[PDB]
Ligand binder design. Structure first.
Ligand SMILES: *[C@@H]1O[C@H](CO)[C@@H](O[C@@H]2O[C@H](CO)[C@@H](O[C@@H]3O[C@H](CO[C@H]4O[C@H](CO[C@H]5O[C@H](CO)[C@@H](O)[C@H](O)[C@@H]5O)[C@@H](O)[C@H](O[C@H]5O[C@H](CO)[C@@H](O)[C@H](O)[C@@H]5O)[C@@H]4O)[C@@H](O)[C@H](O[C@H]4O[C@H](CO)[C@@H](O)[C@H](O)[C@@H]4O[C@H]4O[C@H](CO)[C@@H](O)[C@H](O)[C@@H]4O[C@H]4O[C@H](CO)[C@@H](O)[C@H](O)[C@@H]4O)[C@@H]3O)[C@H](O)[C@H]2NC(C)=O)[C@H](O)[C@H]1NC(C)=O
Ligand SMILES: *[C@@H]1O[C@H](CO)[C@@H](O[C@@H]2O[C@H](CO)[C@@H](O[C@@H]3O[C@H](CO[C@H]4O[C@H](CO[C@H]5O[C@H](CO)[C@@H](O)[C@H](O)[C@@H]5O)[C@@H](O)[C@H](O[C@H]5O[C@H](CO)[C@@H](O)[C@H](O)[C@@H]5O)[C@@H]4O)[C@@H](O)[C@H](O[C@H]4O[C@H](CO)[C@@H](O)[C@H](O)[C@@H]4O[C@H]4O[C@H](CO)[C@@H](O)[C@H](O)[C@@H]4O[C@H]4O[C@H](CO)[C@@H](O)[C@H](O)[C@@H]4O)[C@@H]3O)[C@H](O)[C@H]2NC(C)=O)[C@H](O)[C@H]1NC(C)=O
Ligand SMILES: *[C@@H]1O[C@H](CO)[C@@H](O[C@@H]2O[C@H](CO)[C@@H](O)[C@H](O)[C@H]2NC(C)=O)[C@H](O)[C@H]1NC(C)=O
Ligand SMILES: *[C@@H]1O[C@H](CO)[C@@H](O[C@@H]2O[C@H](CO)[C@@H](O)[C@H](O)[C@H]2NC(C)=O)[C@H](O)[C@H]1NC(C)=O
Ligand SMILES: [Cu+2]
Ligand SMILES: [Cu+2]
Ligand SMILES: [Cu+2]
Lengths: 636, 235, 195
């Protein structure tokens, strides 16, 4: 019965903005009544709250932007999640989903239903469609969407007048985004536009926040996920990759964010479904004038000073006034939880969310204090207030760099690793060599037909993306005696924006983990010959909505999880003629430990680059090797 | 439609030469600004803000979209004009041109394209004064008296100049509301700029002799009483 | 490459020769060959200009803007025959750029022991003529312009009577270069040898 259930849940994601077209779903929406069917829900309080909200009309109006950073939106989405998750039977769950689809905003319903499907036992096999297919308007420029609407409604008669559009195959018409948006931010935004505007990266951020919502309290499974450590590690990896891209395109180090003025602005060029332009941050934005920006920055400074005091003093304050030490090396998780100010933080009243205030300030979304129903505020969020568009703005990377400065301060106070924790007896690496590192640009097609308001075709968008050829890394190692070992590869830049070789201690923060795997080392001489195509950290493209629908309706793979980095974004572009980089191979013992499942050997994720490392403490540690490589770009 | 009737790029003929282009410009701008000030007083917004050369407090968000779907440029609140931006150079050029206009007004004459002095002290020189201020194709000397109002519009439109060209030729531009006559009036900055130009015009008019009791009087005509029946407005 | 400079004249000798080693840019000899139809026989002047092709961001710079960025690298005379011709200019022959002047020690030796006219104090050094470029190639634009020969030691420089920056002193547009066939714009790549 998997196929039919998946088909129905897909039909729930066919046209969010438009109303229900399938008749029996209308019958269910008109027939079901929560009041009399309270007995089928475990959480009766959620049922009462939902009934009250739906009766008083105290809900976010339909056809309006939705943001989780607003309090009332969080309350509404949490209540709906509690109601949906408390469904005893799958039938009750589906019937509540239909009713909410009828009586709930599109974005909120999609998000809550996806979260419920991911975290429900009865729906551990259902596959949810990609976000960039349900709402294409968050990943393509407004001109593209308007042209799509025109070419569709024209009946493809004036389409042949358009030279940009073309018919690649029957029933599909494709455009070019190569020639468009001549007006753009420029500054530091254009050279890295092939990485920051990538659809897959924003989709990955959205899916990550689907797996770990800020408004959802962890269960036994989510309590072993080490939420804070994942936050820190993922932010570090993203910032290291972004810095590598900037060095590749010659833009320099990530600008440091102050408290007086921000020089770089952002113009999104995106449009909401209704047609409201996004807020724009001007260049040379002033933060020390008579504006709400000043008050927001003062609150941000207070909260960050509280975090700094907690880090330095070595303990945090409970909600009653007790001191809880965080000086042990295993307190990184609670530190991250406190910094994030999620619902799992011990004390959110004193440790508040300054990152959201940073996002509000640097989004320059004019607060007009407008409310509907004498209730829910009406907000026009900027790109930074949406996880599916935040990564397009450099300000996000600047803010995360500040948070990573806080994290580095905390890690600095920790004792440095010893020659016993960081050494494996009688394992010496001889030589490490990669076959080649080449990158090239290629074309890809995305389906944006779900935005078209069909009455009674399939428009696609062509985009340019980076990719790399398969590469093999071969290392020879002395093994001493037989062992079961783990090998980790790290990649870092070798020269900074000016030309001086970066010391290893500084590079410790710029090392990007690209592969980790097990091996059984024999006695004597060995050979590791890892191929990039075998790594499980990076995955291939997930099947599109159309492909999944075809494979389902016509009637598995475990190499496509929503919480993995796309393969084509693993390797930096480099330069034509070669760009130098540093590879680091580290071998350690194997210390023995589907929607949201990731686990490796029990140890800090960034080991051994989480703490600062110095050359003088690597003498006597032979199982770590630092080689130099060159990354090339194939021009086309 | 007004700019259709008197395009800046069209030279006047016998009919358009009797239209007194400059006087029409001055009169229409004065009427528009007086009506706008009356509206502001009616809605309790106060006097029209005076435009400086350092910072503009009031911004504008149009909410309009072009046919293709490109959003209009947005001017932020508290825009800074004395930083390391092209705004500073534009403002410097504007100041130079306005100082040239002020010197021409005060000295009582304007300079021809050859270097001759032509007096503008008579009361009938308002037309040529307006033509010079507008810097249209009918101005005697556009090379020395240049169009600072267009530079003001460019500066206060905050249209990011990206120096993009097609055909190795025609630049591609995304104009703001102030650069289009069909959308300029939506922005208060237009009224501020026109108030500055009207300050220049008032300076010129102040230098003129005041009317006498002979020019301003009609023999044996006395008004007794004036009364209107009612003045009501509705939406 | 490395070069040595003599700084002994600063030393306050009482009753040696210290030198300083410095790194400088240089280029290998290059030859430019152009084929031209000549019509009838003439005495002509050929000028070469070099400019960048892309700006700091990546957009191709329009010719009008590049008019201010054109660097004159060579100017010389020729006698064009009738029919097909061939110019084969070698960088080592240009008189605009000169070689290093003899140092004080070298000049003192050559004088006390007991001419050349390719060393004037008012000429650009040869090794600074060509931009460094990039490893892997950097695109640039060469412009060859041919005009008529309009007939015109310490401080002496004179060429055909005309504006020095002709024809790049005034702005130039593509649409006004139709009908002018004696001007050609080619693209080249400059490479840097890493060491
Ligand atoms: C079915 O559906 C419903 C609706 O969908 C779901 O209901 C939600 O359920 C969750 C979980 O139960 C609730 O969250 C918790 O709520 C309680 C109660 O908060 C309410 O009352 C507060 C006022 O009383 C509190 O303060 C007074 C003094 O002023 C005090 O006398 C009283 O005893 C009590 O402490 C309100 O303040 C509060 O909201 C107000 O304040 C909020 C904060 O400023 C503000 O945001 C609101 O807008 C409003 O202004 C609310 O009305 C909370 O006590 C509890 O708080 C814990 O977690 C937060 C972080 O989320 C943390 O900051 C707190 O310090 C506290 O942390 C303790 O518990 C954590 C786990 O919950 C734990 O991880 C911490 O370590 C800590 O516990 C450990 O340490 C502490 C000492 O630090 C120790 O005491 C403990 O024993 C332990 O050792 C949560 O916020 C939602 O409120 C509720 N929402 C609704 C709409 O119903 C329901 O979950 C669903 N059920 C099922 C089965 O699915
Ligand atoms: C058919 O179709 C064609 C195409 O559609 C139409 O052609 C247009 O026709 C109009 C009208 O004839 C032209 O406008 C006039 O052009 C002339 C010539 O300008 C050209 O040449 C200039 C260079 O030569 C000038 O300067 C040098 C020194 O450097 C000097 O030696 C030489 O004698 C001459 O003075 C160029 O500079 C100019 O363009 C360049 O400069 C422009 C300004 O910076 C710049 O914008 C351009 O981009 C370019 O850089 C051009 O190539 C102009 O002389 C004439 O200028 C008058 O008007 C302007 C204001 O518009 C004013 O500033 C000048 O001072 C001058 O004003 C005198 O004439 C006015 C009337 O024209 C008069 O109102 C003024 O009072 C003044 O006349 C009186 O006072 C002066 C002393 O101040 C006195 O000398 C007089 O005798 C008199 O007493 C116009 O700009 C268009 O150029 C032309 N366009 C094209 C594409 O062909 C044609 O009209 C159509 N025909 C029909 C029948 O329909
Ligand atoms: C893009 O996605 C739409 C669905 O949003 C696809 O629509 C399908 O088109 C085929 C054409 O043969 C139909 O048989 C299916 O029934 C359609 N499905 C739906 C849900 O309408 C469209 O084919 C996709 N196009 C591409 C190129 O992937
Ligand atoms: C650097 O310059 C000094 C002159 O300032 C040179 O000094 C000469 O050294 C030779 C050595 O055999 C003497 O014979 C000359 O009499 C010196 N001349 C003077 C004026 O003192 C010195 O040789 C130069 N060194 C180099 C390497 O060029
Ligand atoms: Cu959409
Ligand atoms: Cu500034
Ligand atoms: Cu201000």
């Amino acid at each position: 019965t998997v196929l039919d259930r998946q088909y129905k849940l897909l039909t729930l994601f066919f046209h969010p903005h438009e109303p229900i077209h399938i008749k029996e779903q209308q019958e269910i929406a008109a027939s079901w009544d929560l009041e009399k069917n309270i007995g089928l829900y475990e959480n009766a309080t959620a049922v009462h709250l939902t009934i009250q909200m739906l009766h008083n009309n105290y809900q976010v109006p339909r056809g309006v932007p939705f943001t989780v950073l607003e309090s009332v939106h969080r309350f509404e989405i949490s209540v709906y999640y509690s109601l949906l998750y408390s469904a005893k039977t799958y039938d009750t769950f589906y019937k509540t989903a239909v009713f909410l689809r009828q009586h709930v905003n599109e974005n909120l319903f999609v998000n809550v239903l996806s979260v419920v499907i991911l975290h429900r036992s009865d729906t551990q096999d259902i596959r949810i469609p990609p976000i960039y297919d349900v709402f294409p308007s968050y990943f393509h420029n407004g001109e593209i969407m308007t042209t799509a609407q025109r070419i569709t409604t024209h009946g493809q008669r004036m389409l042949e007048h358009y030279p940009s559009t073309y018919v690649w195959e029957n029933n599909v018409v494709i455009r070019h985004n190569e020639t468009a948006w001549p007006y753009y931010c420029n500054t530091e935004s254009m050279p890295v536009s092939y990485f920051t505007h990538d659809v897959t990266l924003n989709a990955l951020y959205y899916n990550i926040k689907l797996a770990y919502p800020i408004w959802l309290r962890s269960d036994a499974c989510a309590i072993k996920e080490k939420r804070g450590e994942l936050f820190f590690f993922w932010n570090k990896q993203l910032l290291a990759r972004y810095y590598m891209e900037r060095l590749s395109v010659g833009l320099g180090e990530i600008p440091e964010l102050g408290l007086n003025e921000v020089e770089e602005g952002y113009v999104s060029g995106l449009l909401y479904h209704n047609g409201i332009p996004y807020p724009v941050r001007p260049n040379h934005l002033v933060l020390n004038h008579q504006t709400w920006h000043a008050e927001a920055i003062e609150e941000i400074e207070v909260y960050e000073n509280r975090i700094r005091d907690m880090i330095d003093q070595g303990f945090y304050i409970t909600n009653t006034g007790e001191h809880v030490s965080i000086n042990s090396p295993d307190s990184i998780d609670v530190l991250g939880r406190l910094i994030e100010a999620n619902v799992d933080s011990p004390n959110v009243q004193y440790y508040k969310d300054f990152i959201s205030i940073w996002k509000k300030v640097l989004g320059n979304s004019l607060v007009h204090e407008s409310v509907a129903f004498n209730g829910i505020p009406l907000v026009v969020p900027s790109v930074l207030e949406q996880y599916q568009t935040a990564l397009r703005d450099p300000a996000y990377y600047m803010i995360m760099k500040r948070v990573l400065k806080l994290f580095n301060l905390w890690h600095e106070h920790l004792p440095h690793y010893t020659t016993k924790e960081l050494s494996v007896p009688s394992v010496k690496i001889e030589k490490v060599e990669v076959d080649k590192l080449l990158t090239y640009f290629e074309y890809t097609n995305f389906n944006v037909t779900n935005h078209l308001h069909l009455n009674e075709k399939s428009v696609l968008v062509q985009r340019t993306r980076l990719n790399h050829k398969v590469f093999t890394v071969r290392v020879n190692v002395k093994s001493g005696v037989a062992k079961h070992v783990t090998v980790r590869f790290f990649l870092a830049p070798k020269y900074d924006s000016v030309g001086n070789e970066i010391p290893l201690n500084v590079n410790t923060q710029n090392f990007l983990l690209i592969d980790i795997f097990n091996y059984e080392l024999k006695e004597g001489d060995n050979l590791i010959t890892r191929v990039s195509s075998d790594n499980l950290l990076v995955t291939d493209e997930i099947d599109s909505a159309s492909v999944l629908f075809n494979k389902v309706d016509s009637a598995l793979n475990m190499k496509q999880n929503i919480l993995k980095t796309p393969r084509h974004l693993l390797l930096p572009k480099g330069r034509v003629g070669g760009m130098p980089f540093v590879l680091m191979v580290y071998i350690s013992e194997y210390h023995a430990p589907i929607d949201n499942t990731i686990r490796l050997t029990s140890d800090t994720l960034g080991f051994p680059v989480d703490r600062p490392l110095f050359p003088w403490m690597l003498t006597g540690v032979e199982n770590i090797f630092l080689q130099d490589v060159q990354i090339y770009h194939k021009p086309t």
